[PDB]
Amino acid sequence: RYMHNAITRNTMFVAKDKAPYSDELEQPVYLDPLARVEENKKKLVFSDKTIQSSQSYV
Amino acid sequence: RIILAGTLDSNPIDDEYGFKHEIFQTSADKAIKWAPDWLKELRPTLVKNSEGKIYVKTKFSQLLGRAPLMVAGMTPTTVNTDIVSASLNAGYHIELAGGGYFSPVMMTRAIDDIVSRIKPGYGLGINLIYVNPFMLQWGIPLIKDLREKGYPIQSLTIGAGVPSIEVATEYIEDLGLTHLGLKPGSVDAISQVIAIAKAHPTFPIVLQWTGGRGGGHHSFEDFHQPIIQMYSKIRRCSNIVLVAGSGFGSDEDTYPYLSGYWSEKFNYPPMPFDGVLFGSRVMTSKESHTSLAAKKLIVECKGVPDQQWEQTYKKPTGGIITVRSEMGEPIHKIATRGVMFWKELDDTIFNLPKNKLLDALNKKRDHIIKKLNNDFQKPWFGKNANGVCDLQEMTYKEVANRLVELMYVKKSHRWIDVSLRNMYGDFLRRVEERFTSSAGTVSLLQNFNQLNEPEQFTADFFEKFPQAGKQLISEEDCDYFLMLAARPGQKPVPFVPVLDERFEFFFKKDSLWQSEDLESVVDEDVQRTCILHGPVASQYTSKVDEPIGDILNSIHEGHIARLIKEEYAGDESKIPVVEYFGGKKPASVSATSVNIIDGNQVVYEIDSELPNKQEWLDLLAGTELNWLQAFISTDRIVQGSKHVSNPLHDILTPAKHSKVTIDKKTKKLTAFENIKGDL
Amino acid sequence: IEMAWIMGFIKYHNGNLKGKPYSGWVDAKTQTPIDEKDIKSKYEEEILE
Amino acid sequence: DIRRAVSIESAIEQKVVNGDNVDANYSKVMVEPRANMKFDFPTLKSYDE
Numbered sequence: 001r002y003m004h005n006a007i008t009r010n011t012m013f014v015a016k017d018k019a020p021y022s023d024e025l026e027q028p029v030y031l032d033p034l035a036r037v038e039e040n041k042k043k044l045v046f047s048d049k050t051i052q053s054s055q056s057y058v
Numbered sequence: 059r060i061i062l063a064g065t066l067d068s069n070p071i072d073d074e075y076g077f078k079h080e081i082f083q084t085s086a087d088k089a090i091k092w093a094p095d096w097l098k099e100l101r102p103t104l105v106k107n108s109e110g111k112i113y114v115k116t117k118f119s120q121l122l123g124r125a126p127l128m129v130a131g132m133t134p135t136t137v138n139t140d141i142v143s144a145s146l147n148a149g150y151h152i153e154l155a156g157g158g159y160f161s162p163v164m165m166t167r168a169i170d171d172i173v174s175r176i177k178p179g180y181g182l183g184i185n186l187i188y189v190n191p192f193m194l195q196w197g198i199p200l201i202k203d204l205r206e207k208g209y210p211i212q213s214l215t216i217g218a219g220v221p222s223i224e225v226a227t228e229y230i231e232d233l234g235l236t237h238l239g240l241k242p243g244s245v246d247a248i249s250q251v252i253a254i255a256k257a258h259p260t261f262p263i264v265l266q267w268t269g270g271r272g273g274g275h276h277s278f279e280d281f282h283q284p285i286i287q288m289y290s291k292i293r294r295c296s297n298i299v300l301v302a303g304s305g306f307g308s309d310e311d312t313y314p315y316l317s318g319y320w321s322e323k324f325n326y327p328p329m330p331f332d333g334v335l336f337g338s339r340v341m342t343s344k345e346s347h348t349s350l351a352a353k354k355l356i357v358e359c360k361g362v363p364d365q366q367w368e369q370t371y372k373k374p375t376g377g378i379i380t381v382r383s384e385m386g387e388p389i390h391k392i393a394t395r396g397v398m399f400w401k402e403l404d405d406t407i408f409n410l411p412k413n414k415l416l417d418a419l420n421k422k423r424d425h426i427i428k429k430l431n432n433d434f435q436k437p438w439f440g441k442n443a444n445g446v447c448d449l450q451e452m453t454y455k456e457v458a459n460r461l462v463e464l465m466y467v468k469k470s471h472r473w474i475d476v477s478l479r480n481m482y483g484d485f486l487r488r489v490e491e492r493f494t495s496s497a498g499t500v501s502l503l504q505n506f507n508q509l510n511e512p513e514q515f516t517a518d519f520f521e522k523f524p525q526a527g528k529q530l531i532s533e534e535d536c537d538y539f540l541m542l543a544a545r546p547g548q549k550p551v552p553f554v555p556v557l558d559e560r561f562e563f564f565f566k567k568d569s570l571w572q573s574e575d576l577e578s579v580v581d582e583d584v585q586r587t588c589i590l591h592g593p594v595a596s597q598y599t600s601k602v603d604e605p606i607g608d609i610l611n612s613i614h615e616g617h618i619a620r621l622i623k624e625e626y627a628g629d630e631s632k633i634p635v636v637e638y639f640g641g642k643k644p645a646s647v648s649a650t651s652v653n654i655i656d657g658n659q660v661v662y663e664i665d666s667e668l669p670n671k672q673e674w675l676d677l678l679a680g681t682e683l684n685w686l687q688a689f690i691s692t693d694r695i696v697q698g699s700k701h702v703s704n705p706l707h708d709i710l711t712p713a714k715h716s717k718v719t720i721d722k723k724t725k726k727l728t729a730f731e732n733i734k735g736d737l
Numbered sequence: 738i739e740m741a742w743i744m745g746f747i748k749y750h751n752g753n754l755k756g757k758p759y760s761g762w763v764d765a766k767t768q769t770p771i772d773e774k775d776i777k778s779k780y781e782e783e784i785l786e
Numbered sequence: 787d788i789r790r791a792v793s794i795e796s797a798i799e800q801k802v803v804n805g806d807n808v809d810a811n812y813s814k815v816m817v818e819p820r821a822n823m824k825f826d827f828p829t830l831k832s833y834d835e
């Protein structure tokens with residue numbers, strides 16, 4: 001699906017503009033080896049509930 | 059009559075009042091220019107036909123020779139060729155819903171089925187919609203040569219807009235109609251109508267007044283206040299026949315409007331109405347193609363008094379709300395889950411400008427799709443892997459199966475439209491075009507007529523193309539699908555395939571016919587359906603599937619009984635009796651019956667100069683109503699359900715040295731003329 | 738058709754093309770619709786060139 | 787040449803008598819082919835296989 005859409009609309013490569021983390025989260029992700037992106041609004045973004053969460057070590 | 063005895067500068071252009079001199083006109087008695095007395099002049103009266111039938115002689119009934127109770131011409135209901143015919147035979151007049159036909163040939167066929175089924179000689183009208191320049195592109199030229207062939211189309215009502223004056227000239231003079239109907243909604247539209255009538259003081263014009271309390275399309279203006287300013291300046295145009303509708307369902311419901319005693323609520327003279335048309339009252343008739351569940355729903359929805367019809371813009375008022383059209387014109391519709399969803403959508407998404415529309419749809423996508431599959435009639439198309447989904451995540455086979463399920467009624471083994479059949483076929487043409495490679499071979503689809511039972515054809519077809527059951531729809535075959543779904547000249551798609559700026563373009567267009575066939579509804583739940591109806595009229599729609607003839611007869615009889623009790627003292631013998639009803643004015647309207655000389659054994663010579671034509675015809679007619687007076691005065695001669703011009707209406711043109719002989723109480727007319735000196 | 742697409746021979750035009758609605762492959766130089774077969778027979782000489 | 791010309795003549799004679807409205811229906815509606823660019827991840831064999 002993606003390839004067909006792209007090769008038709010010349011958007012195979014979509015340049016990223018903002019990182020998955022936010023500037024206020026760009027460090028706290030770096031220190032947690034378990035904080036990983038969750039998805040919302042059809043976007044894969046880092047949150048705060050994922051950083052140093054108490055449930056990612058069950 | 060008002061006489062401005064102070065000043066002598068006569069006269070006002072419309073002769074509203076007299077001046078100083080009108081005291082002095084000393085011609086033997088002719089001075090007494092009386093004032094229009096609406097309560098006396100055009101009061102509803104009774105008249106017995108020679109067959110013993112009793113009619114309500116009005117200015118309108120007198121025009122149509124039948125009861126003063128006509129049927130509007132709604133596009134969904136009135137387009138069915140059965141309801142309109144089965145009520146013409148009931149004796150009441152109907153205008154055919156021209157809106158429901160997109161092709162001249164289809165309308166011509168429907169007309170021909172009408173003519174074959176109505177009584178020989180009856181005539182019908184055609185309701186057109188002025189804001190469809192395509193429909194007036196081919197309808198008007200059709201009416202021209204059709205009337206030229208002489209089909210019994212006796213009227214053309216131009217609803218949803220009043221034409222300009224010079225185009226009304228064409229509407230009147232060229233196409234040989236008997237009466238022209240107009241549906242004004244604004245006081246300025248009424249001014250335009252009067253500007254029209256004064257241009258052709260002899261061609262009758264039926265003014266159909268509909269307030270805002272009506273059904274279907276909708277008008278903002280109140281029902282009374284417009285006419286309460288124009289009743290006077292209308293009645294000063296003798297050609298305009300005024301008919302009020304928009305929410306009438308019972309005999310006593312409308313009786314004050316016929317009598318005119320309705321103005322008492324406003325401390326005004328009684329202002330009688332000529333005729334009364336009907337809208338939503340008839341949709342529950344047996345002879346209507348309204349879905350049984352839809353009729354049941356209509357009977358369910360309670361009415362709303364006129365004092366509180368304006369609250370329809372907010373809440374379900376007895377189960378009826380208005381809502382903006384594709385173009386923002388209000389449209390009174392019954393209140394179903396689908397209709398509530400319609401209103402909510404118009405309220406939040408469609409009111410927005412173009413820009414944020416995409417985003418609003420994006421943040422509301424799943425919620426929209428929820429009710430579009432739950433409450434609306436054009437459901438969300440994509441449905442794959444047991445989940446609602448987008449289009450581009452469906453295999454070809456399941457795409458085709460969904461198209462079948464949403465465009466072919468398995469119960470009646472028919473297509474919603476053959477043009478949809480052709481769309482489906484044109485899509486399979488692309489499927490096979492795709493999944494084949496350098497073949498130059500025969501297509502499994504040679505004739506789209508194979509598709510008249512797709513259920514098995516496609517099923518066996520996907521064997522020659524197995525992987526189309528598993529490869530998803532490609533995009534170039536998806537955008538093509540959409541481009542099909544909105545090709546011109548095709549019936550609009552019965553579902554919604556996407557969420558884009560054209561959302562309403564798929565959501566609202568052609569949202570009317572489904573009330574006729576709820577079997578095309580995904581679950582045949584009327585709550586998906588868009589049914590048009592009038593708020594105030596609903597408080598009378600209590601019986602379902604009653605014959606269309608009975609309704610109008612049930613109310614005409616109530617009117618007759620009331621008018622007998624009131625203006626004839628409960629004695630029917632006092633009712634005047636005429637042989638036939640129509641054509642000549644029996645009440646002395648401003649028509650030349652005084653120069654009509656009636657007699658038993660009469661001869662009167664004539665020369666080339668005296669007289670002109672019309673009054674000569676009248677002289678020949680005689681005052682009273684006899685077959686000869688009819689035949690000499692009738693405008694129309696029926697030739698086996700045709701309406702061709704009257705032969706005598708020109709062959710008896712005044713001529714030099716001629717003479718006519720009407721002797722032995724009109725038992726024979728005998729016209730003479732001079733030949734070679736002999737007569 | 739892929740080598741045509743990356744060499745800039747065809748461009749998937751969509752929408753209205755000279756009035757008619759269109760969703761398909763189009764030449765890149767004159768911008769006229771082209772079936773999926775004429776791709777080879779029409780460009781294979783140039784592509785390999 | 788005679789088997790060509792007599793064939794042409796009897797074809798056009800039929801196209802006149804039968805009319806040119808059904809003779810197009812004798813020519814079968816052949817299928818144009820499209821391209822079917824998939825992506826086609828490498829085919830997974832079955833486990834036991």
Ligand SMILES: NC(=O)c1ccc[n+]([C@@H]2O[C@H](COP(=O)([O-])OP(=O)(O)OC[C@H]3O[C@@H](n4cnc5c(N)ncnc54)[C@H](OP(=O)(O)O)[C@@H]3O)[C@@H](O)[C@H]2O)c1
Pocket residue numbers: 133157160187192218273274275276383384389477546547548549550566567568569570
């Ligand atoms: N005054 C009132 O109270 C009142 C009440 C109800 C409705 N109305 C009016 O009456 C109209 C009723 O029509 P609608 O709203 O149901 O239609 P619609 O949703 O406005 O869509 C009609 C369009 O679809 C196309 N179409 C429809 N059927 C077709 C067929 N069988 N074949 C090919 N093309 C077809 C037509 O294209 P073409 O251009 O090719 O014809 C036409 O432009 C409305 O537009 C409304 O304004 C007024």
Ligand SMILES: Cc1cc2nc3c(=O)[nH]c(=O)nc-3n(C[C@H](O)[C@H](O)[C@H](O)COP(=O)(O)O)c2cc1C
Pocket residue numbers: 130131132133134135155157185187217218241268269271272273274275303304305306335336337338339341590591592593594595
């Ligand atoms: C079921 C139904 C279908 C209608 N279809 C049309 C139409 O195709 N064109 C039009 O100008 N008015 C249409 N109308 C409006 C009526 O002609 C009239 O203006 C209104 O019904 C009068 O209001 P009332 O029903 O309360 O007397 C329709 C009304 C109803 C109830």
